Amino acid sequence: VALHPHDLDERIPGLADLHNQTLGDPQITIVIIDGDPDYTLSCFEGAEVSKVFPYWHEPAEPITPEDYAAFQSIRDQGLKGKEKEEALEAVIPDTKDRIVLNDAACHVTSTIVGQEHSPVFGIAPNCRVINMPQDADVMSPLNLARAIDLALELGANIIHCAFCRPTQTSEGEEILVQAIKKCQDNNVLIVSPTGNNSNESWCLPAVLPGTLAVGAAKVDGTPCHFSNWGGNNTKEGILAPGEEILGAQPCTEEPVRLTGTSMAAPVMTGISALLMSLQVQQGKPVDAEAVRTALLKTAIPCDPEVVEEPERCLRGFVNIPGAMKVLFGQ
């Protein structure tokens, strides 16, 4: 029986049992590199969250509730594609792109640290979360590397990198590669999404060695058609719930369900946070690489008779119960 009923218990075998053992520990710090979330929401009341704005950015003009209202109205109407961007352009041309970021940062941050009994109950609500907004080229590898270095200095155990910088290969700028290696050398996990390009292009940092790449799964566990895959996405990535994931949006207590690898990544950041929290609770040392390799090696591969291209599932669907066996002997 689940002591902390979570929306993803039925889609994620072993989640409920893991929540019965922990909701996170404050000694585990997650730094989220994304936009600027809304801490006034009740899902963050009592959450140990704080913002650190990179000092080398000039802060952007605040965004009016009205602009957020406009964005959400166009979403609620279910407009999509060209029609959606013509709508956004007509009412909020100068803030549409920042709102996309900030909105997603709300959703992602709540998926991770949302407090129980609020509108959004996240995976790891008792962990310490530092948002590092990039609201103020901003996805350039230089700037992500700089952000990463700071996240380490801030004491990150996990760095959730919400960003996808395009690439047609596994090569990224060396500065970013060095930043990822630096995370491995310091026992810090980096999670990031594989992207929603349907393999028309790939993403940095997902495809760089060292990162935990995350792909998006449907409700039934099969991979979403748009979720990028192949190369290092497959070798070092894992599939997790990505469709219809519940989360927050700014300025309103009403939550919204979103779809994408950006919504699957946070779930894995959360699951990883709990596995690390459990190490602390049991006096074992915190070990990011053990957690990452445990998740990868126990991931369940898709059935070739159900999914046409199994490599789309990357190493496989997240398998908490296997992870628990490897790390804790359960």
Partner: peptide, 9 residues
């Protein structure tokens, strides 16, 4: 328009 972070469709 790239369908990231949230996919429409």
């Amino acid at each position: 328009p790239i369908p990231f972070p949230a996919y429409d469709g």
